[PDB]
C-alpha cells in the first residue's frame, strides 16, 4: 500500500515520526502513546508560527525582507507571554529593547 | 555525517505565515534551538507527570497537562486547542 506521512493525517508541517522517535529515545518513559507525538508536534508548530509571525512583523517594520536575530529579539521581548516564556533565555546577536529612563532625559 | 534539524519545517511554517519573507542562517539556528528547548521542557514535564501518578506511558493527557503547566495563559489555551484539534483530525481518519 502507498504510504502517507503521519503529519499529513494530522494536517501538520512538523514531523510526527521524528518527534515520536525522539520521545522514544529520550528516556522519558517506558512507553509512548500514539497521540502524544501528534499533540507535541501541534504544540511546537503553533509556537513556531507565533514567533515567526511576530518576527516577520518586526522585520517588515524595519523595511527588511529577511529575518535576523534582532527581529527575533524584538518579537519576543515586546510580547508579554513570549517574554514570560523566555525570561531566562539569551538570544545571540539579539540586542536590547530601546528604552531610556525618564529621569535621564533633559528638562 | 547526517545531522538532523528543524530547518525545513521552520521554513515551511514561515512560508505559511509570511509568504514573501526569508530568514537568515543565524535566525534559523536560533529557531532550531528554541524548538529543541521547548521540546525538552514539555517532555521533561510529561515525564515527571507520568512518574508522579506511577504510570509508565506518556499519552496526550500528560502532554496537555505539561502544556498547561509550562505555557502562560492565552498561549496555553491556544496550544491546547491546537493539539486537541490535531489529535481529533488524526484519529478521525
Amino acid at each position: 500500500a502507498k504510504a502517507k506521512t503521519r503529519s499529513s493525517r494530522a494536517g501538520l508541517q512538523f514531523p510526527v515520526g521524528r518527534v515520536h522517535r525522539l520521545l522514544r529515545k529520550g528516556n522519558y518513559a517506558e512507553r509512548v502513546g500514539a497521540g502524544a507525538p501528534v499533540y507535541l508536534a501541534a504544540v511546537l508548530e503553533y509556537l513556531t508560527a507565533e514567533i515567526l509571525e511576530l518576527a516577520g512583523n518586526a522585520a517588515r517594520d524595519n523595511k527588511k525582507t529577511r529575518i535576523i536575530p534582532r527581529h527575533l529579539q524584538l518579537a519576543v521581548r515586546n510580547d508579554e507571554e513570549l517574554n514570560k516564556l523566555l525570561g531566562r533565555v539569551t538570544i545571540a546577536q539579539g540586542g536590547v529593547l530601546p528604552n531610556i529612563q525618564s529621569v535621564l532625559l533633559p528638562k | 555525517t547526517r545531522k538532523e534539524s528543524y530547518a525545513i519545517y521552520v521554513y515551511k511554517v514561515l512560508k505559511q505565515v509570511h509568504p514573501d519573507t526569508g530568514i537568515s542562517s543565524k535566525a534559523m539556528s536560533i529557531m532550531n534551538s528554541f524548538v529543541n528547548d521547548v521540546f525538552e521542557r514539555i517532555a521533561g514535564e510529561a515525564s515527571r507527570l507520568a512518574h508522579y501518578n506511577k504510570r509508565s506511558t506518556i499519552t496526550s493527557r500528560e502532554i496537555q497537562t505539561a502544556v498547561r503547566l509550562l505555557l502562560p495563559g492565552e498561549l496555553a489555551k491556544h496550544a491546547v486547542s491546537e493539539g486537541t484539534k490535531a489529535v481529533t483530525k488524526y484519529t478521525s481518519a
Partner: peptide
Amino acid sequence: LDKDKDRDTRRKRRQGRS
C-alpha cells in the same frame, strides 16, 4: 481582552491561508 482577541485572529489567518 484587547490583546486576547488579537491572538485569535492570529490563528484564524493560519486556518484561512490553509
